[PDB]
Every structure is written in C-alpha cells, then in structure tokens.
Scaffold this active site. Structure first.
Site, short mmCIF file in Angstrom:
data_model
loop_
_atom_site.label_atom_id
_atom_site.label_comp_id
_atom_site.label_asym_id
_atom_site.label_seq_id
_atom_site.Cartn_x
_atom_site.Cartn_y
_atom_site.Cartn_z
N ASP A 1 40.71 36.41 26.52
CA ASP A 1 41.18 37.77 26.29
C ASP A 1 42.08 38.21 27.44
OD1 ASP A 1 39.10 38.15 28.26
OD2 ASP A 1 37.69 38.34 26.59
N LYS B 1 42.87 42.70 22.34
CA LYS B 1 43.52 43.67 21.48
C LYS B 1 44.99 43.88 21.90
CE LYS B 1 39.88 46.69 19.66
NZ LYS B 1 39.62 48.17 19.57
N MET C 1 34.18 49.19 33.48
CA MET C 1 34.88 49.95 32.45
C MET C 1 34.43 51.41 32.45
SD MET C 1 33.13 47.82 29.24
CE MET C 1 31.43 47.33 29.53
N1 SAH Z 1 39.89 41.99 38.40
C1 SAH Z 1 39.16 43.09 38.20
N2 SAH Z 1 39.24 44.15 39.06
C2 SAH Z 1 38.48 45.28 38.88
N3 SAH Z 1 37.64 45.34 37.80
C3 SAH Z 1 37.56 44.30 36.94
C4 SAH Z 1 38.30 43.16 37.11
N4 SAH Z 1 38.01 42.29 36.10
C5 SAH Z 1 37.10 42.88 35.28
N5 SAH Z 1 36.81 44.12 35.81
C6 SAH Z 1 35.88 45.13 35.29
O1 SAH Z 1 35.09 44.61 34.25
C7 SAH Z 1 35.24 45.41 33.10
C8 SAH Z 1 35.17 44.51 31.88
S1 SAH Z 1 33.46 44.25 31.34
C9 SAH Z 1 33.41 42.46 31.66
C10 SAH Z 1 33.27 42.13 33.16
C11 SAH Z 1 32.98 40.67 33.46
N6 SAH Z 1 32.04 40.09 32.49
C12 SAH Z 1 32.47 40.54 34.89
O2 SAH Z 1 31.46 39.88 35.10
O3 SAH Z 1 33.06 41.07 35.84
C13 SAH Z 1 36.55 46.15 33.28
O4 SAH Z 1 36.55 47.40 32.64
C14 SAH Z 1 36.63 46.34 34.77
O5 SAH Z 1 35.88 47.46 35.20
#
Ligand code: SAH
Ligand code: SAH
Lengths: 451, 445
Positions: free
Chosen positions: A248, A270, A376
């Site tokens: 994604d 999306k 998020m």
């Molecule tokens: N590089 C990044 N920098 C800051 N937040 C991030 C990020 N990558 C993912 N996120 C955060 O993760 C959310 C997606 S929910 C999935 C997160 C992932 N499974 C994990 O373990 O981190 C986004 O809304 C954002 O808040």
C-alpha cells in the site's frame, strides 16, 4: 540507472581496439578471454600484442585509425593516448550504432568496462561508473572477500544439472525450490571441491528425490516506516524472493526498490480489506510466494490478523515477519526515545481512527509517566488535545509530530500539548503523534536532520 | 569467462523490445530506468504499456514483429512466449549486429541480463546463467543487504572530490585509507541523502582535517529480540563496519555471529550502566567505530538514551538504528497480534524505580505487554483481578521470543501466576483478548 549492465556473448563477434599500449593490452586480454574476434589498430604495439598476433589470437593493423575496421564490429574500444583519435573512433562507432568504450573518458563513450570477479560461470561486475575507480578497485575486493572460494564449482555443477532439473521439475516453482536446497548444501560444495564424485552423486540423487512442497504461502512482512535500511534481514529475503508483493501507500518507494524485479507488484492502497484478503487468497492458491508488505509492523494497527484468519481458514501457509513499527522508527530518527530513566515507564501505542462505535479511554491515556504514541490520529489531533487535557494531562506536556519518520522527507514539529491541534495542521499523513516527557530529549539525541 | 559484462550508456539509444506481457514489462521497466529510447512491438499490450505510451515514455507498435524496427537499435529484447517470434527477433538482431536478449533462452542470443544491484553510479551485476536465477538472487539479496541504498550518492560525491584528495594525501595508501573511511562515514551518507549541503561540507572537512586514524563514532544498534533475521539492514551494515562491538546477553549469539570477525568485542552483561557509558566514550575517543548492540530496540527499556547523553556532551558523533522490540517480535512469532479489529484500542509496553498504576493497567480493550516482569508476576495476577479485569482474560508468557528456544505458555489470568514460574528470563507477559488469537495465527512451530 546511469548504465545498464549486460553480459555480452562475444564468441565469434568482431571487436576493434584502437591503440596498442598497456591500456589496449589490458582490454585486449579481457576481450580475448571472452572469445571475441579481435582487431587491434594502432601506430605502435607493445610486445605483448605481437606475441598474441604470432599465436593467431588477434589481428594487428599497424597504422593510423581506420574507420572501416568498425564496419562489422559489435564492440569498439578507443585505448590510445590521443584524445583526438579516440573521439574519431567514438564518432565512427556511434554512426554505426556500435557500443564503444573510451578508456580514458568513461563519460564520453557508450559503454564502460566494469571490474570483473570471474568465478565462471558465476560472474560479478562492479563499476562506480568510472567516475570513481577507487571504489571499483575496492568494492571488487570486498565482493572477492564475500563469495566463497568454491562458488564457481558449485555454479558450474548447477549449470551441468540445469537440463536435468528442467526435465524433472515442470514448473518454475519446483525448480526454484530445488535450486534453493542445492545452493545451501555445504557438503555438496565440499564434495565438489574435493572432486569426490561418489559424494557429489549421493547428495545429488537424494536432492532430486525429495518431495517438493507445492503450496503457496503468504508472508506478512513489516516494511518498517520508510527508510529502506530498516527492513529486517528476513523481510528483505522475503521480498527478494516473492512472486507477488501486495503493498500500500505506507510502504516507501525505497522499500519497493528492494522488491526483486521479477515480482508482480499489486497496489491495494486507495480498498476494502475483504478484497485484499481474497487478493492474497487467490494468488497464494496459485502456489506463489505472496508477500503482503505493510508499513511498519504487521501486527500493530495493521489489520494483519484479519487477512491471516482467512488464509488459515483456507489451508494456506503463512508466517509473519515483524517490522520496525512507526513508533520505534520515529523514536530513533527524531531523537525521542520511547522510554527513558523515569520519564516514561510505559509506552502506549494508540489508534486515533477508531471503529464507528465508542471512543478512547481518555482517563486511562492521561496517566502520568507514559509515552503516548497515536497512530493515524492527525484528523483527531484536536480531539486528542481536548481529551488529554480534560482528563488531567499537564498542559505543557511536550508533544511531537513526526511526518514520514525515517525518510529523507522526515519532518518533525514539536511543542506542548496545548499546541497539538495547531501542530498537526503543519504536517500531513503519514504522521505519528508522540506525547510525553521523552519528547524533550530530542535536543540532546537528534542525530538525523532538520527537514 | 563466457560473457563480457559491459555497462551500457542507453540514454537516448533506440532499443526494441518484442513482447507485451509481464516479462516484457519488466525488461521495459529496466530499460526505461536506464534511459533507453524504447519501442515495444507486440500483438497486444498489457495495460502498463498503454500507460507508459500515453505518458510518451516509449513507443508501442501493435502487430507482428517488424524486422525494420531494429534499423537503428542498439539493443533488442525478445520477450514473447513465442519461440518462433523470439528467433525471428534474434536472427534479425544478429544480422544487424545488435546485441539481443531472449528472456526465456539466455543461450539463444548475444547478451543476458544479469541480476543488478543498483546504487547508481555504483552498480553491481551478478549472473551465472539465466532462466532460474536462484544463485544470482542469493548473491543479489546478500549484496542488497550489505550496500546501503544511498551509497550511490556517496560514490557520486567521491568522484567530485578525487582531485582534492590527491593534493592532500601524497601516497596511494593514504588516499586508499581516506577512501575507506569516506565510504563508510554515516553522517556523510545521511547528509548526502538528506540533501543537507551544510552537514556534507562539515563532514568533508572533518574527514580531511581529523587524523587518518580517527573514525570515532558510536552507533546504537537494536539487535532485535533474538532471531538474527530480525536485525535491520542498516544494523547489519553497521556491525560489519565496527571497530568494536559492545554487547550484553540480550544480544543473541546468532546476532553476534554476524559481527565482523576483526572487530573487538566487549561484553558488558552480567555491570552498572555508568561503566558501560564510560566504555563507549572511552572507545569512541580512541578513534574507533563503536557499535553498542542492544537487545530488541535501543529506545524501549534499553537505557539507550542514557548512553547517548554521555556521548553528545563529549562531541562524539552517534546515530541510532532502531530494532524489533521484544513485543513485536514475540507478537509475530507467537501468533498474538498486539492489535486486532476492536479487541484492543491500544498496546501498552510496561516494565516490571517508582510505582505502577494498577487500575490503569486493568482497563478494557488493551493489550498489556510486560517486560522484565517475571519476578513481579504473582503480583500481576493478583492486582489485575483485584482491579476488575475479568477472570477469563487470556494471558501468555513468551520466553526467548523469535529464537529457536522460544516457549509460549498461555491460559487465563487466573492461571497467570503459576504460568509465570513455568518460564524464565528473558520473557514477556502479554495480557489481552488478542492472546486467544494464537490458536489460528501461531505459525512458528
Ligand atoms: N513513516 C511514518 N512516520 C510517521 N508515522 C507513520 C509512518 N508510517 C506509518 N505511520 C503511522 O502509522 C499509521 C498507519 S497504521 C499502520 C502502522 C504500522 N502497522 C506500524 O507498525 O507502524 C499512520 O497513520 C501513521 O500515524
Ligand atoms: N527474546 C525475547 N523474548 C521475550 N522477551 C524478551 C526477549 N528479549 C528481551 N525480552 C524482554 O525484554 C526485557 C529486557 S528490557 C530490554 C528490551 C529491549 N530493549 C526491547 O526492545 O525488546 C526482558 O526482561 C524480557 O522480558
């Protein structure tokens, strides 16, 4: 890429070298080992060329450059000290769409001659584009201190068995599984080095005898938060071997550049998870190595368990490769450790985007000596400020927002809780909200950059 | 040597691909990236070709293979499923002295495409003969893991500086030693990557001004919870370039076996934290690349922050490579996702020098993960029941998570105390509804 590496078959193909000194000599040697039909055109020749010419290994044309000598060539090399002559050669080669190396002028030619590590039939070529001969002269040494000594003999034996492997294994998958077992059998390597054909054959026959698993599998791989270097070793192994990588928008472009080029990439950013599940499902039912590549860690707000429960239901094997979750990556790259001293004794990873029914447990989240990490939560940042203040968190609690943590585009804005709504307006998705005293450590521990 | 590897400058050179399926799309992607002026000739095109063609990135010619499309080509690729067509392409390219690849028949034409490790302008190509590609993949994967993905920016900048290095270092050995420091300097690489033209110059002058013997810097590297496969690429790359590795018992032997053979190893496990801090700066001020390997992630109950504070005030460059914390490692390997649907709105990582909030720990819709909490485990069962957590709440202890010695004991909170002494350090206690998912998601076996 600046150059496309190709491995040319030069057997019985005319190549021209212009020049006759030690440089032309080195190139002539390489082209002769590749079996090229070689013509050397120069005013003078060092004695090695007459030695080669006396043995009928090449043709010497003593004199100034002859353009016509290119007419049937496949490669040309200008290896004279005369940049004017070398440009005439390049020009002649260009009009004839002949690939041409100008040795003293890497950028001026068409092709470049890389450093070669010869473990025939295994070949490894290195070039820093000729702009830096030092690293070529040096990474080549590193690779040479990487490849096992008898890798050539293993690779040679692999070549001898290719036909038999293709006969006995109808599908690409089966042959891949054979090759995988073949190349990690240490005893087989050693029996090859010892010319111990009894041992070679015993090991080989048992190898072909083994039933191959034909099941597809789905591996959930944590991409990490963006920096390609934060993929785990196992995650890289998985995407360097996947047939389909489903990913994604939260899988960085740099991570996607580590997906092997022969993998089918399926973008599902999306969509309804019910359709993802079945995309994983369908491709794994086809027997292929499927990787569901997810930002961060698959099991932290990843919906990862949801896909897996359906695969388990469909008898499809699966494993999970954890990844650096956004909290850890943002933590390390913003200089905000999630725990420290007694700043924080617990870390809370909290979602902001909650199911339509019900809200968070704000009294629980307002507890002291915690680091809060909201995933998020950008659109709810104002509500998080309101709620956290209202359930008693200090107004001056440092907060930080990390956008694109661990990437070159990483942006950190920071302040106190009362600024949270306003800070979130300054960043975009994807962003993490860190709330807690550890945010004040940024000023001593920030080693990454300032946007 | 059966093939001469050459690196072709393809920018603005006419190249022809014949084929319009998935195979051709991969070759076409590669040639596009190399800058080829690309014509693709196929009976039909998968939609990715019509996308590239709408964008004017190549030219499509629909229909039978037309030999005259080669008339000004430098490279040809036969990428169809039709042997007859591929041979028509191959013969027409052979007669025009155009190097040609037949994807499904690497011995059938004049070049093969190797596995590529692209760090432009630095490039590595590996091949051992085509079709299958496993040996090349294994080497490529290993090299992908050892070559930082920004190394091309380092290599580009080196060529700019090649004049300056000679008019300072007189002997090739000195130049060589300089270049070795140059290509492993983390802050140069990260400055180049981050376009921080300030930090580049600072790092360059420091490389020219500081002694050719000094390379003093500390990297905090998270080893992950045990499985050597859970080290990051950067972590691997860092422990390969280390002059000295400082580690403790929470770093698995498997991780430690990844450590550069000529590196000094300093064991600081069972040693109060102050002596560790002292060791790190003491080594970094001797001009040595120091890796502090820490179990899991350095910034999660690792005291990672305290180590760096000693260093930041001492002027010693440092960086942090995050690691797989025990929670996510154990989660993935025990089939217990930390979150799942509406089971848990939050995950709490909590340790076992102050106090601990019980009614807070007892609240619904969380996943609790206790680090270093095996001693306090009897209390844990008592306090959580005594603060409202339902009796039937699933609990799990994960010991030696992600290693081949991993043991998982699971039950409900009412059995948690007895489940605890059934297990030894290092172990996590996980409490939450997600624990019950282990039945369908436990793949590690
Ligand atoms: N590089 C990044 N920098 C800051 N937040 C991030 C990020 N990558 C993912 N996120 C955060 O993760 C959310 C997606 S929910 C999935 C997160 C992932 N499974 C994990 O373990 O981190 C986004 O809304 C954002 O808040
Ligand atoms: N392989 C493993 N399996 C289960 N728990 C582990 C573990 N490795 C470390 N831990 C937990 O971590 C505690 C030490 S605290 C250090 C944690 C580390 N920095 C990390 O991020 O994981 C141990 O008491 C144990 O509970």
């Amino acid at each position: 890429m600046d150059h496309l590496p190709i491995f040319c078959q030069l057997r019985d193909r005319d190549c021209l070298i212009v020049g006759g000194g030690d440089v032309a000599e080195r190139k002539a040697r390489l082209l002769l080992e590749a079996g090229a039909r070689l013509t050397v055109n120069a005013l003078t020749f060092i004695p090695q060329f007459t030695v080669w010419a006396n043995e009928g290994m090449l043709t010497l044309v003593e004199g100034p450059f002859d353009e016509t000598l290119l007419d049937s060539c496949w490669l040309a090399i200008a290896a004279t000290d005369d940049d004017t002559v070398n440009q005439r050669v390049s020009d002649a080669a260009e009009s004839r769409r002949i690939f041409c190396n100008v040795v003293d002028a890497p950028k001026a030619a068409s092709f470049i001659m890389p450093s070669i590590i010869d473990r025939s039939p295994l070949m490894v070529a290195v070039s820093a584009g000729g702009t830096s001969g030092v690293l070529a002269r040096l990474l080549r040494e590193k690779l040479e201190s990487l490849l096992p000594q008898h890798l050539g003999q293993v690779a040679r034996y692999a070549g001898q068995l290719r036909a038999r492997v293709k006969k006995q294994f109808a599908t690409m998958g089966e042959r891949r599984r054979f090759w995988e077992k073949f190349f990690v059998n240490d005893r087989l390597a050693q029996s090859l080095a010892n010319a111990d054909e009894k041992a070679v054959n015993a090991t080989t026959e048992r190898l072909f005898s083994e039933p191959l698993d034909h099941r597809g599998e789905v591996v959930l791989v944590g991409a990490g938060p963006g920096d390609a270097g934060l993929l785990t070793l196992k995650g890289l192994q998985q995407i360097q071997q996947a047939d389909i990588v489903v990913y994604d928008r939260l899988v960085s472009d740099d991570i996607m550049n580590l997906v092997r080029r022969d993998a089918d990439r399926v973008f599902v950013g999306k969509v309804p998870q019910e359709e993802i599940n079945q995309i994983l499902l369908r491709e794994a039912q086809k027997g292929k190595r499927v990787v569901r590549l997810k930002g961060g860690d698959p099991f932290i707000f990843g919906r990862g368990g949801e896909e897996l429960e359906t695969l388990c239901h469909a008898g499809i094997p699966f494993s999970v490769v954890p990844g650096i979750t956004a909290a850890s990556g943002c933590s390390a790259y913003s200089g905000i450790p999630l725990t420290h001293r007694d700043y924080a004794q617990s870390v809370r990873l909290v979602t902001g985007h909650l199911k339509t029914g019900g809200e968070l447990d704000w009294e629980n989240l307002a507890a002291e000596k915690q680091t809060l990490v909201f995933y998020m939560g950008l659109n709810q940042a104002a509500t998080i400020q309101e709620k956290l203040i209202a359930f008693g968190m200090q107004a001056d609690m440092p907060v930080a927002l990390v956008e694109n943590g661990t990437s070159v585009k990483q942006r950190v804005v920071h302040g106190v809780l009362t600024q949270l709504g306003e800070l979130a307006q300054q960043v975009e998705s994807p962003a993490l909200i860190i709330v807690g005293r550890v945010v004040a450590l940024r000023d001593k521990l920030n080693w990454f950059s300032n946007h």
